[PDB]
Design a protein around this ligand. Structure first.
Ligand SMILES: CCCCCCCCCCCCCC
Ligand SMILES: CCCCCCCCCCCCCC
Ligand SMILES: CCCCCCCCCCCCCC
Ligand SMILES: CCCCCCCCCCCCCC
Ligand SMILES: CCCCCCCCCCCCCC
Ligand SMILES: CCCCCCCCCCCCCC
Ligand SMILES: CCCCCCCCCCCCCC
Ligand SMILES: CCCCCCCCCCCCCC
Ligand SMILES: CCCCCCCCCCCCCC
Ligand SMILES: CCCCCCCCCCCCCC
Ligand SMILES: CCCCCCCCCCCCCC
Ligand SMILES: [Li+]
Ligand SMILES: [Li+]
Ligand SMILES: [Li+]
Lengths: 347, 347, 347
């Protein structure tokens, strides 16, 4: 970020990036120009010696379509909070679900991965979410270095109209009932970490009717993660088991899913950072004769070259291991390989 | 505001807020997450010793819906102007109608009130409006301390298509023909002010043919207001009598309406600011057997706690005194109570 | 632009304008309030002694419609790049097509002209375009002041769906196949410059099947321009011959078009800058019996008064010389005059 203001106990950082990005793929819904930018503000005010107030907004602005195209910009984050000494912090707004406190460890590919693969945004507490109240505590009240935890609650974000509605209604794939989540990460020593996360949300009536697949009163996720970040090497893995919470493309939700991501990278001193990763999401107990089906399955190979802290370039290659079948077709799941080339200015 | 630039006769202030906000109500169209942010810029250039040029933009960005939701951001204000010594100022663009120079005195509730109640936005010259040319004068050319006035003109903002169209067409509820407004405020003593405002706008053919209620060539408003702002106390009231200008929910406009708002607040030195208010809008001479009907009626009780000038939190309680009847049902007027809880970072 | 950050090898400029603008016309699709603003960020990082990284984003935000209106903001530019000493620069993203390196010389009217007349945006490489990779060389490797050249490539931006699709699909009028462009400008004498530009793009299947007019596998443009900018006088002209690249209003593309623009301006030291211009676009070989038709034809008279570098005001008169006929009617081409009045704050 770029600190543009710091006066009378208030500071503002302007941050973002401009990514000149192109995808090459046989999948025409993915192929082509993908240029976009992000811009945001992070503000912090010192209220007193122990209390600080804060706010953060992050906006995504696509720049790959025309000036007459619709729906090209959206808010990723918008929350306000308070932090009190070692007693912890509390924030509310649009923010990450606590499951991402651990799954973020494998969200480090040059381009692919993250909330475009084993989980998505507005997908219960797995990525960015509306209306999350989050309590966080670092170093266990200042008593245990490296031990962090979080407790999170999310109110229902319901249907557009009818009995299940809320003011901010949306379609079944992005709805949620009241829910909660927890996370615990332990940086046991500089560079070695283990993490766990859990979430439990009520599902909505539209989630149990509109989509073809997935039925159940509650959505749940269980995540374990490991991270090694030392000696110029980055290794991470995350395993998440879900119930009625993983999307099976447009078909609905998987009654059960097993998601696994693993990544290995090396950072050369001159700036090059090669990366190899494997990601999979296996749906189980799917209705309508599907049984067990792969929702996502690919090997990723790529590299980022960091010119400095403000400029980088990258290549990423998604080697898609899914086969074309009635499940991927009917769910709108891409089975093609993709090559991305990006040139990024960051601030 | 945060001054981020001040060089060679030009200054720029960045301002805004991030409001982590949740509403609790039996009305499903308002219940739920209401998080949003505002961001704006106020610029001013010293052209010469007495002439200054200025501009202001204010943007509202909702953050309570998904990244694939539409129409989540909009411009509240955007105008450019010139100010010259005691001769006054002139600006043009999207700005407040001059009726708000007086009705703004009661727009101080912790969350509710303002252009969501007795008047709205794009509602003739009662709130924010497109295409307003506004002349303002402070202290009557420097001759009368505390006496301010404004004169404003608004060109037609017509239908989307047909004979009544303009480039920036919209539906009947937000249309207007040529309009004029004036305001005058006087600080009688230190902390005590009185104000008056008047507006007169031509109504469009769609306003006089499409909606169920309200018919007349012109919309007209008359406002009187009073304010006491001293000794940590804030008291204000505004009374506005309107003709063919107050929306009767979705049914059109009230042939006549009488709007009244009153508020009392106290600012404790430690930061707490309790507030109590009463707001009503009474429609008269409504067609179709409605006769006289309450369009809005509620008591508001709340409080804001200011941690400092950059962070606050609040609770607001709208105690809705409207009864469920054929008018509130057919007009889509909410009769339910609402509780709002907000946590706000400001810059 | 306003430099708002400059630390540790990175600098950021914030720029933009707020234009309080009103059009007066018998054409109801352009008459009325036209207020808008632009905001952008320009960043540059010093990577090493010779290499710099950069990024630029420019956003257009309309402020002439209501807060409930759709599609009011869009990205004009978003690109990232690298510049290596005098060897040149390379950038990729949404940026101007290199034909504008020469046609921009007549895009100097107080309000009209530019990409709203003989060419448009997302119109091959004639104005702003998605997915352009651009190499630029300034001042011939730093050896010849004013001798500039560019080489540009654009990937296909295809249909919304079907065989011709790309991820960022759009309608036929804004599609393009793979394309290339080049430009070269230089000074002949002090204050006198000449410029040439060429572009060649593949056309798309929808361009050759959906609209009635224009058929061909390739879109090409050839431009020559001249500019005199000295002694307070500005004179410029541009002539462009196109094949399957100039829009024939809503009916398709002209198989051939000849575009000509000429402008004369004078800059008074006190700030007034009168301007007189003539613009025409002649379509040739149009199908359906249209044959040769004027697509655009007008004289422009106006003036801008610059208060300083941050504030200006203007008037512009478009004196439309087109005759009303079956072509202008069926193509939706405006034959009416327009008067614009603007007051602009810039940063
Ligand atoms: C400001 C904080 C708002 C808290 C909202 C809690 C959500 C509860 C929904 C049930
Ligand atoms: C040990 C870390 C190895 C990283 C491998 C990256 C190759 C692409
Ligand atoms: C000292 C020369 C400046 C003359 C004033 C410029 C005119 C615009 C002022 C409008 C204010 C209302
Ligand atoms: C400076 C000219 C502004 C336009 C004048 C509008 C006058 C409106 C009031 C009279 C209306 C007469 C009945 C239509
Ligand atoms: C130029 C000032 C007059 C404009 C008045 C517009 C409203 C007219 C209402 C009818 C009288
Ligand atoms: C000069 C000191 C005056 C003290 C100001 C505090 C007064 C609180 C007023 C409450 C009155 C409510 C009626
Ligand atoms: C301290 C004064 C508060 C007034 C509260 C009004 C209560 C609601 C009355 C209608 C039910
Ligand atoms: C002075 C602030 C009082 C408002 C508290 C809100 C009361 C909640 C009532 C819910 C039933
Ligand atoms: C980051 C630069 C990417 C350039 C991509 C060029 C598009 C090729 C289309 C075939
Ligand atoms: C790097 C060299 C660039 C050369 C550009 C050639 C452009 C052709 C221009 C022809 C102008 C004809 C106008 C009808
Ligand atoms: C100074 C230019 C601002 C635009 C003026 C608009 C005139 C009022 C509309 C009729
Ligand atoms: Li299930
Ligand atoms: Li595959
Ligand atoms: Li009436």
């Amino acid at each position: 970020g770029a600190e543009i203001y710091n006066k009378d106990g208030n500071k503002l950082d302007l941050y973002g990036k401009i990514d000149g990005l192109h995808y090459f793929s046989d999948d025409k819904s993915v192929d082509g120009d993908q240029t976009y930018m992000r811009v945001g503000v992070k503000g912090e005010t010192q209220i007193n010696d122990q209390l600080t107030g804060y706010g953060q907004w992050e906006y995504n602005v696509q720049a790959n379509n025309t000036e007459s195209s619709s729906d090209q910009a959206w808010t990723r984050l918008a929350f306000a909070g308070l932090k009190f000494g070692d007693a912890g912090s509390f924030d509310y707004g649009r923010n990450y679900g606590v499951v991402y406190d651990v799954t973020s460890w494998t969200d480090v590919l040059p381009e692919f991965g993250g909330d475009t693969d084993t989980y998505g945004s507005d997908n219960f507490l797995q990525s960015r979410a509306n209306g999350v109240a989050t309590y966080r505590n670092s170093d266990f009240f200042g008593l245990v270095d490296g031990l962090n935890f979080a407790l999170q609650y999310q109110g229902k974000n319901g249907s557009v109209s009818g009995e299940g509605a809320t003011n901010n209604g949306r379609g079944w794939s992005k709805q949620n009932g009241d829910g909660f989540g927890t996370s615990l990460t332990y940086d046991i020593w500089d560079g070695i970490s283990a993490g766990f996360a859990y979430s439990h949300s009520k599902r909505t009536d539209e989630q149990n009717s509109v989509p073809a697949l997935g039925r159940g009163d509650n959505a749940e996720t269980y995540t374990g993660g490991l991270k090694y970040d030392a000696n110029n090497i980055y290794l991470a893995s995350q395993y998440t088991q879900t119930y009625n919470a993983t999307r099976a493309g447009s078909l609905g939700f998987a009654n059960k899913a097993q998601n696994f991501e693993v990544v290995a990278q090396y950072q050369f001193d001159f700036g090059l950072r090669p990366s190899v990763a494997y990601l999979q999401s296996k749906g189980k107990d799917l209705e309508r004769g599907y049984g067990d089906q792969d929702i996502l399955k690919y090997v990723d190979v790529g590299a980022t070259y960091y010119f400095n802290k403000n400029m980088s370039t990258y290549v990423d290659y998604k080697i898609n291991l899914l086969d074309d079948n009635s499940f991927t077709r009917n769910a709108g799941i891409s089975t093609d390989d993709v090559v991305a080339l990006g040139l990024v200015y960051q601030f």
